[PDB]
Design an enzyme around this catalytic site. Sequence first.
Site, PDB file in Angstrom:
ATOM      1  N   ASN A 113       0.854  -1.206   0.000  1.00  0.00           N
ATOM      2  CA  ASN A 113       0.000   0.000   0.000  1.00  0.00           C
ATOM      3  C   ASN A 113       0.882   1.244   0.000  1.00  0.00           C
ATOM      4  OD1 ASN A 113      -2.431   1.386   0.092  1.00  0.00           O
ATOM      5  ND2 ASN A 113      -3.094   0.474   2.043  1.00  0.00           N
ATOM      6  N   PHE A 114       0.254   2.401  -0.273  1.00  0.00           N
ATOM      7  CA  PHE A 114       1.000   3.706  -0.241  1.00  0.00           C
ATOM      8  C   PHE A 114       2.200   3.712  -1.236  1.00  0.00           C
ATOM      9  CE2 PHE A 114      -0.862   3.000   4.027  1.00  0.00           C
ATOM     10  CZ  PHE A 114      -1.907   3.952   3.952  1.00  0.00           C
ATOM     11  N   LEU A 115       2.003   3.076  -2.390  1.00  0.00           N
ATOM     12  CA  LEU A 115       2.852   3.362  -3.545  1.00  0.00           C
ATOM     13  C   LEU A 115       2.576   4.811  -3.986  1.00  0.00           C
ATOM     14  CD1 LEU A 115       4.576   2.901  -6.133  1.00  0.00           C
ATOM     15  CD2 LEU A 115       2.457   1.783  -7.088  1.00  0.00           C
ATOM     16  N   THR A 149      -4.530  -3.826  -3.509  1.00  0.00           N
ATOM     17  CA  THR A 149      -5.770  -3.311  -4.081  1.00  0.00           C
ATOM     18  C   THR A 149      -5.386  -2.065  -4.877  1.00  0.00           C
ATOM     19  OG1 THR A 149      -7.483  -4.108  -2.564  1.00  0.00           O
ATOM     20  CG2 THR A 149      -7.355  -1.759  -3.035  1.00  0.00           C
ATOM     21  N   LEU A 392      -6.970  -1.050   3.260  1.00  0.00           N
ATOM     22  CA  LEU A 392      -7.033   0.393   3.589  1.00  0.00           C
ATOM     23  C   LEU A 392      -6.601   1.419   2.528  1.00  0.00           C
ATOM     24  CD1 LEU A 392      -5.483  -0.217   7.087  1.00  0.00           C
ATOM     25  CD2 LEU A 392      -8.013   0.106   6.546  1.00  0.00           C
TER      26      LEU A 392
HETATM   27  C1  LIG Z   1       6.547 -10.919  -2.492  1.00  0.00           C
HETATM   28  C2  LIG Z   1       6.347  -9.437  -2.250  1.00  0.00           C
HETATM   29  C3  LIG Z   1       5.775  -8.719  -3.496  1.00  0.00           C
HETATM   30  C4  LIG Z   1       5.694  -7.183  -3.324  1.00  0.00           C
HETATM   31  C5  LIG Z   1       5.140  -6.383  -4.572  1.00  0.00           C
HETATM   32  C6  LIG Z   1       3.765  -6.852  -5.067  1.00  0.00           C
HETATM   33  C7  LIG Z   1       3.352  -5.860  -6.160  1.00  0.00           C
HETATM   34  C8  LIG Z   1       2.854  -4.533  -5.538  1.00  0.00           C
HETATM   35  C9  LIG Z   1       2.284  -3.682  -6.648  1.00  0.00           C
HETATM   36  C10 LIG Z   1       1.967  -2.241  -6.241  1.00  0.00           C
HETATM   37  C11 LIG Z   1       0.644  -2.145  -5.422  1.00  0.00           C
HETATM   38  C12 LIG Z   1       0.277  -0.692  -5.141  1.00  0.00           C
HETATM   39  C13 LIG Z   1      -1.008  -0.491  -4.335  1.00  0.00           C
HETATM   40  C14 LIG Z   1      -1.302   0.987  -4.213  1.00  0.00           C
HETATM   41  O1  LIG Z   1      -0.648   1.682  -3.434  1.00  0.00           O
HETATM   42  S1  LIG Z   1      -2.573   1.597  -5.181  1.00  0.00           S
HETATM   43  C15 LIG Z   1      -2.359   3.372  -5.183  1.00  0.00           C
HETATM   44  C16 LIG Z   1      -1.083   3.791  -5.911  1.00  0.00           C
HETATM   45  N1  LIG Z   1      -0.901   5.248  -5.789  1.00  0.00           N
HETATM   46  C17 LIG Z   1      -1.442   6.255  -6.483  1.00  0.00           C
HETATM   47  O2  LIG Z   1      -2.356   6.157  -7.293  1.00  0.00           O
HETATM   48  C18 LIG Z   1      -0.958   7.653  -6.097  1.00  0.00           C
HETATM   49  C19 LIG Z   1      -1.093   8.612  -7.264  1.00  0.00           C
HETATM   50  N2  LIG Z   1      -0.246   8.111  -8.310  1.00  0.00           N
HETATM   51  C20 LIG Z   1       1.099   7.926  -8.300  1.00  0.00           C
HETATM   52  O3  LIG Z   1       1.809   8.253  -7.343  1.00  0.00           O
HETATM   53  C21 LIG Z   1       1.757   7.378  -9.558  1.00  0.00           C
HETATM   54  O4  LIG Z   1       0.973   7.810 -10.745  1.00  0.00           O
HETATM   55  C22 LIG Z   1       2.008   5.855  -9.428  1.00  0.00           C
HETATM   56  C23 LIG Z   1       2.985   5.604  -8.275  1.00  0.00           C
HETATM   57  C24 LIG Z   1       0.725   5.092  -9.111  1.00  0.00           C
HETATM   58  C25 LIG Z   1       2.662   5.297 -10.716  1.00  0.00           C
HETATM   59  O5  LIG Z   1       3.712   6.179 -11.186  1.00  0.00           O
HETATM   60  P1  LIG Z   1       3.776   6.670 -12.725  1.00  0.00           P
HETATM   61  O6  LIG Z   1       2.411   7.064 -13.234  1.00  0.00           O
HETATM   62  O7  LIG Z   1       4.851   7.717 -12.728  1.00  0.00           O
HETATM   63  O8  LIG Z   1       4.135   5.377 -13.567  1.00  0.00           O
HETATM   64  P2  LIG Z   1       5.632   4.853 -13.916  1.00  0.00           P
HETATM   65  O9  LIG Z   1       6.049   5.617 -15.162  1.00  0.00           O
HETATM   66  O10 LIG Z   1       6.566   4.949 -12.733  1.00  0.00           O
HETATM   67  O11 LIG Z   1       5.456   3.334 -14.165  1.00  0.00           O
HETATM   68  C26 LIG Z   1       4.477   2.863 -15.128  1.00  0.00           C
HETATM   69  C27 LIG Z   1       4.074   1.467 -14.667  1.00  0.00           C
HETATM   70  O12 LIG Z   1       3.494   1.498 -13.337  1.00  0.00           O
HETATM   71  C28 LIG Z   1       2.301   0.713 -13.342  1.00  0.00           C
HETATM   72  N3  LIG Z   1       1.317   1.235 -12.346  1.00  0.00           N
HETATM   73  C29 LIG Z   1       0.616   2.392 -12.390  1.00  0.00           C
HETATM   74  N4  LIG Z   1      -0.181   2.476 -11.308  1.00  0.00           N
HETATM   75  C30 LIG Z   1       0.042   1.362 -10.550  1.00  0.00           C
HETATM   76  C31 LIG Z   1      -0.494   0.922  -9.366  1.00  0.00           C
HETATM   77  N5  LIG Z   1      -1.460   1.643  -8.698  1.00  0.00           N
HETATM   78  N6  LIG Z   1      -0.069  -0.305  -8.944  1.00  0.00           N
HETATM   79  C32 LIG Z   1       0.890  -1.054  -9.571  1.00  0.00           C
HETATM   80  N7  LIG Z   1       1.415  -0.653 -10.767  1.00  0.00           N
HETATM   81  C33 LIG Z   1       0.985   0.549 -11.235  1.00  0.00           C
HETATM   82  C34 LIG Z   1       1.802   1.032 -14.763  1.00  0.00           C
HETATM   83  O13 LIG Z   1       0.813   0.117 -15.188  1.00  0.00           O
HETATM   84  C35 LIG Z   1       3.039   0.866 -15.610  1.00  0.00           C
HETATM   85  O14 LIG Z   1       3.267  -0.537 -15.744  1.00  0.00           O
HETATM   86  P3  LIG Z   1       3.857  -1.122 -17.130  1.00  0.00           P
HETATM   87  O15 LIG Z   1       3.628  -0.055 -18.300  1.00  0.00           O
HETATM   88  O16 LIG Z   1       5.426  -1.434 -16.950  1.00  0.00           O
HETATM   89  O17 LIG Z   1       3.137  -2.514 -17.503  1.00  0.00           O
HETATM   90  C1  LIG Z   2     -14.065  11.818  -1.884  1.00  0.00           C
HETATM   91  C2  LIG Z   2     -12.963  11.166  -2.763  1.00  0.00           C
HETATM   92  N1  LIG Z   2     -11.638  11.284  -2.506  1.00  0.00           N
HETATM   93  N2  LIG Z   2     -11.004  10.687  -3.395  1.00  0.00           N
HETATM   94  C3  LIG Z   2      -9.448  10.626  -3.436  1.00  0.00           C
HETATM   95  C4  LIG Z   2     -11.802  10.075  -4.278  1.00  0.00           C
HETATM   96  C5  LIG Z   2     -11.283   9.226  -5.478  1.00  0.00           C
HETATM   97  C6  LIG Z   2     -13.108  10.344  -3.885  1.00  0.00           C
HETATM   98  N3  LIG Z   2     -14.243   9.879  -4.485  1.00  0.00           N
HETATM   99  C7  LIG Z   2     -14.622  10.811  -5.527  1.00  0.00           C
HETATM  100  F1  LIG Z   2     -15.070  10.061  -6.580  1.00  0.00           F
HETATM  101  F2  LIG Z   2     -15.569  11.656  -5.008  1.00  0.00           F
HETATM  102  S1  LIG Z   2     -15.041   8.280  -4.182  1.00  0.00           S
HETATM  103  O1  LIG Z   2     -16.188   8.122  -5.118  1.00  0.00           O
HETATM  104  O2  LIG Z   2     -15.448   8.149  -2.748  1.00  0.00           O
HETATM  105  C8  LIG Z   2     -13.853   7.038  -4.636  1.00  0.00           C
HETATM  106  C9  LIG Z   2     -13.530   6.892  -5.997  1.00  0.00           C
HETATM  107 CL1  LIG Z   2     -14.293   7.809  -7.273  1.00  0.00          CL
HETATM  108  C10 LIG Z   2     -12.579   5.980  -6.399  1.00  0.00           C
HETATM  109  C11 LIG Z   2     -11.944   5.196  -5.447  1.00  0.00           C
HETATM  110  C12 LIG Z   2     -10.889   4.213  -5.858  1.00  0.00           C
HETATM  111  C13 LIG Z   2      -9.697   4.405  -4.859  1.00  0.00           C
HETATM  112  C14 LIG Z   2      -8.651   3.296  -4.885  1.00  0.00           C
HETATM  113  C15 LIG Z   2      -7.694   3.527  -3.751  1.00  0.00           C
HETATM  114  C16 LIG Z   2      -6.475   2.608  -3.988  1.00  0.00           C
HETATM  115  C17 LIG Z   2      -5.674   2.564  -2.671  1.00  0.00           C
HETATM  116  N4  LIG Z   2      -6.461   2.153  -1.482  1.00  0.00           N
HETATM  117  C18 LIG Z   2      -7.532   3.118  -1.196  1.00  0.00           C
HETATM  118  C19 LIG Z   2      -8.431   3.148  -2.422  1.00  0.00           C
HETATM  119  C20 LIG Z   2     -12.253   5.335  -4.091  1.00  0.00           C
HETATM  120  C21 LIG Z   2     -13.208   6.245  -3.661  1.00  0.00           C
HETATM  121 CL2  LIG Z   2     -13.556   6.330  -1.939  1.00  0.00          CL
END
Ligand SMILES: CCCCCCCCCCCCCC(=O)SCCNC(=O)CCNC(=O)[C@H](O)C(C)(C)COP(=O)(O)OP(=O)(O)OC[C@H]1O[C@@H](n2cnc3c(N)ncnc32)[C@H](O)[C@@H]1OP(=O)(O)O
Ligand SMILES: Cc1nn(C)c(C)c1N(C(F)F)S(=O)(=O)c1c(Cl)cc(CCCC2CCNCC2)cc1Cl
Length: 392
Positions: A113-115, A149, A392
């Site tokens: 989480n918190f990527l 997730t 979460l």
């Molecule tokens: C054994 C232990 C195992 C441990 C690890 C298990 C795996 C854990 C996996 C992680 C679980 C995380 C759970 C959470 O925290 S989910 C929430 C993640 N955080 C955010 O959404 C915060 C807002 N966004 C960002 O900070 C960035 O836009 C992120 C960090 C999301 C990507 O930064 P950026 O936009 O600058 O991209 P890039 O240029 O570096 O890289 C592009 C690549 O990244 C792939 N990408 C994009 N989004 C996600 C995502 N949510 N999960 C996994 N991969 C993701 C994407 O398909 C592409 O892949 P590909 O083109 O190579 O195919």
């Molecule tokens: C009130 C709000 N805050 N944020 C950041 C977002 C996306 C919302 N919403 C917005 F649409 F109004 S929302 O409908 O409640 C919502 C929307 Cl649209 C989309 C999502 C997907 C979030 C996936 C993250 C992934 C990491 N773990 C926490 C959930 C969650 C929620 Cl809670």
Amino acid sequence: GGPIKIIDPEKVSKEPDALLEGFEWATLDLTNETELQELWDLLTYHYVEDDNAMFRFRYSQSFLHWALMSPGWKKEWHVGVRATKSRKLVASICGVPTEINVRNQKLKVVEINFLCIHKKLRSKRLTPVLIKEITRRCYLNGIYQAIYTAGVVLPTPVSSCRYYHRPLDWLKLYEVGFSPLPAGSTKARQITKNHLPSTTSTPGLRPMEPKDIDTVHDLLQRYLSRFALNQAFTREEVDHWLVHKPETVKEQVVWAYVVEDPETHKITDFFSFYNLESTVIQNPKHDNVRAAYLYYYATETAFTNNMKALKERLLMLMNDALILAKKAHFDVFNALTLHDNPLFLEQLKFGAGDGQLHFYLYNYRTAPVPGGVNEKNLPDEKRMGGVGIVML
Ligand SMILES: CCCCCCCCCCCCCC(=O)SCCNC(=O)CCNC(=O)[C@H](O)C(C)(C)COP(=O)(O)OP(=O)(O)OC[C@H]1O[C@@H](n2cnc3c(N)ncnc32)[C@H](O)[C@@H]1OP(=O)(O)O
Ligand SMILES: Cc1nn(C)c(C)c1N(C(F)F)S(=O)(=O)c1c(Cl)cc(CCCC2CCNCC2)cc1Cl
């Protein structure tokens, strides 16, 4: 189902891969207030937004302390990247350990989480490098599978569940752009639609106490066993995730309530919900939305397999959850279509949301798990029994 590949402990690298010029790996110590603050500063301005850039999750420092230092946690799995020169934290990826049941195979896993990457470093393919690093840190500790997730679709999801939303303070939600005024209607009418009773109705209902841990642990495990994918809770995980510690935690994050039977005094049901605000990005009137999210729950009623009786008990319990969340000043009550939630969401006036939560497993293969919805993405009582874990 089963693991995709076996990891050779002999060949796990003792050293991390290289990073973009000017950046370095840093392990975070979240017991240090300064470092908790730095992670909070990153997420508060760079974590998950909606598609309209109206909202951004605002996990509190208290929530971060709770989500990340859960039973078994290791600082090695709180991974940061810093700028070599300024020392600024600019990216993060975190894990905590737990056990899950995947179709009656118990698996030791990390929940990831918190990527997060600073807006200025996006689209530089740093994500795969962060993922590979935390994977290497877990392998070194003998953990080879993960669950996570995301609100985005990535390779081979195991399930998908739809977000639902129960307005508690409809007028605040309307003012922040969360909720529409439909349309032949008025404010007074939407408030009416959303009104809640002033007092709860489940007899015996009270706040969970430390004394309830063992009975809640047994009921929750029995309940969760009815799900194909579930969290295999320990007693310490019951204490950590369900019993708020007011002496040590100044900003409450978890609320849990039990039903002490009036006659037998055994706990027959329970529910819980957590505090996760969102910042409202640009609004003269408000800067936050205070959401409560339904967390875990259980009820002895489930064990009858009488779905009409389960539905009625849940309607009562969950409406009490709404009443309590409003008393504690939450604006909206959010839930997903997992557990038995399709039984009550629409009748208790949860509106269908545009958000979806997708579930994934690393290095483990299993058949698709039902997530509470049909092919039209609507809640379906015939599609439950699948997802039994709340991340979460
Ligand atoms: C054994 C232990 C195992 C441990 C690890 C298990 C795996 C854990 C996996 C992680 C679980 C995380 C759970 C959470 O925290 S989910 C929430 C993640 N955080 C955010 O959404 C915060 C807002 N966004 C960002 O900070 C960035 O836009 C992120 C960090 C999301 C990507 O930064 P950026 O936009 O600058 O991209 P890039 O240029 O570096 O890289 C592009 C690549 O990244 C792939 N990408 C994009 N989004 C996600 C995502 N949510 N999960 C996994 N991969 C993701 C994407 O398909 C592409 O892949 P590909 O083109 O190579 O195919
Ligand atoms: C009130 C709000 N805050 N944020 C950041 C977002 C996306 C919302 N919403 C917005 F649409 F109004 S929302 O409908 O409640 C919502 C929307 Cl649209 C989309 C999502 C997907 C979030 C996936 C993250 C992934 C990491 N773990 C926490 C959930 C969650 C929620 Cl809670």
